[PDB]
Design a protein that fits this description.
Chain C: Belongs to the bacterial ribosomal protein bL27 family. The structure is cut from a larger assembly and holds chains A (47 residues), B (135 residues) and C (108 residues). Chain A has 47 residues and is mostly helical. Chain A has two helices and no strands. Chain C contains one helix and seven strands. The chains are: A mainly alpha (47), B alpha+beta (135), C alpha+beta (108). Chain C binds five RNA strands through strand 1, strand 2 and helix 1.
Chain lengths: 47, 135, 108
RNA sequence: AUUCUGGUGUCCUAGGCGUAGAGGAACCACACCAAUCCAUCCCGAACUUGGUGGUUAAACUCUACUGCGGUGACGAUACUGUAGGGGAGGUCCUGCGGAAAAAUAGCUCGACGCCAGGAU
RNA sequence: AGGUAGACAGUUUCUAUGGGGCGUAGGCCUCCCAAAAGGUAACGGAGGCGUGCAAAGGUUUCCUCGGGCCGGACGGAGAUUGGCCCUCGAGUGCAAAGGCAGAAGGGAGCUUGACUGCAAGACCCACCCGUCGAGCAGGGACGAAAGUCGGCCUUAGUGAUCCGACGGUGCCGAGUGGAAGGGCCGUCGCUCAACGGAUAAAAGUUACUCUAGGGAUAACAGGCUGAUCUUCCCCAAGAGUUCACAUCGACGGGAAGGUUUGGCACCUCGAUGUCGGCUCUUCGCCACCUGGGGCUGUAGUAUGUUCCAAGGGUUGGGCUGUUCGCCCAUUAAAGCGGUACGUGAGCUGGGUUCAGAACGUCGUGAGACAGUUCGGUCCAUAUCCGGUGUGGGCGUUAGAGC
RNA sequence: ACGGUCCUAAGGUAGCGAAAUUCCUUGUCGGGUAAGUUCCGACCCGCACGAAAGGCGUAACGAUCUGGGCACUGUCUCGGAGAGAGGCUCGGUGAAAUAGACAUGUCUGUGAAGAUGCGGACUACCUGCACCUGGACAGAAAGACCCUAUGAAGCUU
RNA sequence: GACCAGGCCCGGGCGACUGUUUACCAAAAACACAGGUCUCCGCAAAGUCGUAAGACCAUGUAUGGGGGCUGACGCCUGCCC
RNA sequence: ACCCAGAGCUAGCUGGUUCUCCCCGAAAUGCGUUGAGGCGCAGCAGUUGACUGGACAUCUAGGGGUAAAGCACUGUUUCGGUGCGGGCCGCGAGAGCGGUACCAAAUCGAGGCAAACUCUGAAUACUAGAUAUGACCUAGGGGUCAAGGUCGGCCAGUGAGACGAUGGGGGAUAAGCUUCAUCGUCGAGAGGGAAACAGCCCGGAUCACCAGCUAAGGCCCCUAAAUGACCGCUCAGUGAUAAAGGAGGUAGGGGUGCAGAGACAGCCAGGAGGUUUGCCUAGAAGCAGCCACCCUUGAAAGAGUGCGUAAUAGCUCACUGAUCGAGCGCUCUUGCGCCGAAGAUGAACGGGGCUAAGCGGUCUGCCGAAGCUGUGGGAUGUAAAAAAACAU
């Protein structure tokens, strides 16, 4: 034969998982309405 | 064996075959022609063998032209020998052909027969050629 | 199988002599500063400018270097001093070097 | 202030040739002779010296045409900065940014400064 | 005092290297590779230098080459002489690159700046070294003058240090005056060519050998690679009475396989035993025979070709250490490969890698030579996995025998 | 066999010759055997025999090398039986080299490119004893080959 | 009749022969050998060992003594200074 | 030889070199070397002084001859036209010469190529100069911090590099090959994706939390998340693995030839006389090779595309009638498949399995790291000390 074959990191070049589909590349995080202001957490008033 | 006649220098580099062949796209002499698609290093043995086989199917008349002439040399080092210690002597001469280049032209036969002929001439060569009519 | 390797008759050179344009066009120079080490007269000598034994082109006076067009397909090199060179404390460099200096002084 | 001719540049082939015509009132050049100054590796061809009786023919100057020479886009295309992708067949494809050479349209038969002398 | 025995002694006997050796190279200059600053490696591709010139320098003035076409005695493609035409393709002492028009190219006149004392300032760089230099001082050269001249149109023509040598010089000169001897300035003496030069002065062999190291570095094995090998396929010129495609298939093209010969040097040099034979396996198919087929230039017999199929089988000798091979007698047939070219803690030791000895040869010699010959010590009580056997325990839901 | 010409100090005489010398090579021819890369005799293209590092012969002698025959047989076809000494079991005495830790499967994949230990599968109650050596790159000796060190030592001119 | 107690033949290479040799991998074709040849040495000899004295040679003297090479025996042993 | 001594000989060589936390953190290059696995100096670390302003970003100016392109120069090259000059033949045999089945300078026209060619000439890069206020306090004031070099002192290691992308050289445009140039990662870097897998992709681990959001990549089960959606494509277990070539496999697009004055495929029909044609007289006779490639009779027919013959004979196909009655024939282009495709202990997409749980295109949720957010704790530095931040 004369097809030298893919080995070492050259395998890892070829058969790495990757998206390569315009719609799947976009997307990102999901948007929301942020939130009304919340109270403290642990107010004291004692001793 | 279309060998060059006493060129400047003996041995020379490989370079590479980027780009489409722009200039040798046009047809001058023939009305039908064989044109290349993939780039390759075409030896003079491949040219001559294409020319013979194409000529055999001309038969009654119609003239054939070649439009590629090797020029570039290639050296294979002395067979079964370690790396280094200079270059080797040039074995054979090659035509750097790029995509979209004329290889053979032909005129003066029926389109029946020319197409038949260039099939054989395609079969002798190392690349995916194609038939082109224009002139 | 183990054949002999043929020796070469090549493999000599001289390490690049470092010629070319030392002081570029529209740039500062001195009295005596070498502008060009050229092997022949690629560029030619203009006004305010010496030309040496090696076709080395050096400035005689202060001022900025100029690569003029000689006439029929050649190049000259002349040198011109510059009249007034204004500096404004408005600008960013001036602002920042004074800020830096003031920080230096403030610390110590 | 304007236009010529004679000298000096900036600007160097948009500024150079060819073709066609035109200039001797001035300035400029070709024709007369050469003991001498001075000269010819020979020769007053040239250099030089002394004269003027011819001429705008050659050169030079000036006005035209694009025949050449020269310069030359826009658009595209090659190529490539950077971020990616396809092929085992050896190079190709994409986004983002820069962008030729060639070719052609077309542009050119100079411009402009100072001084000497002549004319309005 | 001069000669004269490796008889005897101390040493020396370079590095690069796609393992070493054999060769080739080792310093400097030009071009490319070099990727449009500079720089840049390879046992990458191309060439040069280790000078020449008293003028081929300096300056003052003058000149325009080369190649063609046409005419002209000998004279022709070419000597000299005239005209014409592109004009810098010529020349420039010597390789190349960069340069050079009334020139840096060619000629003439006069000369010596191929000069002393320096030097603001830059370039180039690890250091050592190298390079350009406006200008000033003196004393000249050439020109009417302005000016130009401290070698060459530029880049090669070269070696540091120590030491010695020659010319110049109250600078020192070991009580003081001298002198001997130094210093100082100008200069001379290296194929120190392994050219940043270890010494003024140095070659070989070891299978009689030893030590320190190295999988940084070869030979066996694997791995990558697949040029070579092995096996297929595309094309179809042609051979086959006619007919490329029964059977072969030129010129050419494309594949797989990892059995050959290589390339690489990735694991292993604090050791993984190298060929062939014996014993015992197993597996692959690219099928030698045996089963079943298509085509045939298949009358039948016996073939040829090629498809399916790896279940089984694939002798006994002569010669050689041999695998391989040839031959004899057979036979259904005498298949080809992988398994560390299966298997040495299973065997053998004929071959090949120790010491002895010889022949040819190479070597002045010691010694040497995949040249040849004769002789030459093959370890081991099985921990574990793994195998062939064979028990015991426990499990199987109350326990047992069949 | 016979001559021409060059170089050299001179160009191998006798003898022997494919040999302990011969690469090409299992030279070719004949003998020996059903068949003979070894053997014997002859040829001569002596890569690279040769006259006291002797040449060529030679009766005898050789734990000498190398071919062939007769006799003889388990060397072999192709094994089989039996006797002892072990091996095995019981009692007594009682070592060794080795050993990071070891709860120590097969397949293919992976990885310093040849894995009980990493990935996926497959297989597999726990534990002795007898036998067997394919693997633990099993043990043994800081490779004796190869190369390196401006290492060591012998020997030569 | 047990134990004990030659196997024999034919052809070739090398060395004549009995002999010696690598203790612990080599027993031979290797060394030695009788024989041959060359060369040195006349005695206070050459040679050898010693700084020297002197020792061996030799209580010997050329038919003897030291060294080089070859290796019984047969026939031989050429050309080149 | 041994024994003792010089003598702990030397060993640019190998091995080894022992408690803890915090801060910074390389190099594997150039140059020279009896040097190449050593050493020197530079380069790159730390530490401590001095000098100042840069850094990253955008925008101008400079000289480049590289990619590209080109044929005016230097070589190289094919075809045509003009054709000096050359090959061969012909003469009343010493003056004289003419033919010429012919190879071809030099120019012209068309047409290529070139690391060591350039009338041209990019992008980057290089050099220089210009312009811009980085995070926290009531458009500035005054604040707090982070943010780069040059020179020098003291004192290190390094000088075996590896792979990937690109530009090349060497090689066989073979190698997990080798050598340079620019950049990434490893080296010295954990974590997540890649079945396992230094060097690929994501991202830089101060420490705690049984909180949250996300990157790369994914959502049938092993095994976190959609047995989600709508529109296409495959029938091969493709989806894991390679070409030349083979092809009514299947889906889409454009262009192109005929066609209910009736095409396509079947189906009995027709498919002629000089043509034994001139030709090398052995025959080429529609069909070895030559040219001519007639015209008639006609619903149609070529002096012929193939079979069959020594050549004829004969069998077909071109075409046309007729039967017949609706969409069919021949190229171009893709998309996804099939064959081509065979190795040695045993299946090998990671396994089960899947007709989608595969591929293409689009839309939205979710999962997902030691990244980021939150909540607390430590240590540095900004000064000296504590609080207070900012960075680390």
């Amino acid at each position: 034969s004369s097809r030298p074959q893919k080995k070492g990191t050259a395998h890892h070049m070829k058969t790495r998982p990757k998206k390569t589909a315009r719609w799947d590349i976009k997307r990102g995080p999901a948007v929301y309405p942020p939130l009304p202001p919340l109270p403290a957490e642990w107010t004291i008033v004692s001793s | 064996m279309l060998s060059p006649k006493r060129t400047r220098f003996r041995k020379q580099h490989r370079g590479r075959m980027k780009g489409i062949s722009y200039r040798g796209n046009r047809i001058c002499f023939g009305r039908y022609a064989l044109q290349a698609l993939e780039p390759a290093w075409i030896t003079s043995r491949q040219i001559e063998a294409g020319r013979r086989a194409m000529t055999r199917n001309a038969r009654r008349g119609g003239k054939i032209w070649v439009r590629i002439f090797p020029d570039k040399p290639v050296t294979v080092r002395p067979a079964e020998t370690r790396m280094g210690s200079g270059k080797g002597s040039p074995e054979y001469w090659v035509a750097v052909v790029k995509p979209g280049r004329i290889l053979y032209e032909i005129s003066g036969v029926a389109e029946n027969i020319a197409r038949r002929a260039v099939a054989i001439a395609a079969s002798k060569m190392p690349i995916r050629t194609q038939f082109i009519i224009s002139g | 199988h183990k054949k002999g390797a043929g020796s070469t008759k090549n493999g000599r050179d001289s390490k690049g002599q470092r010629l070319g344009v030392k002081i570029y066009g529209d740039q500062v120079a001195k009295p005596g500063a070498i502008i060009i080490r050229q092997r022949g007269t690629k560029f030619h000598p203009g006004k305010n400018v010496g030309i040496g034994k090696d076709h080395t082109i050096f400035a005689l006076i202060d001022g900025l270097v100029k690569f003029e067009k000689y006439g029929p397909d050649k190049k000259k090199v002349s040198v011109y001093p510059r009249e007034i060179q204004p500096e404004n404390p408005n600008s960013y460099r001036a602002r920042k070097r004074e800020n830096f200096r003031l920080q230096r002084e403030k610390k110590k």
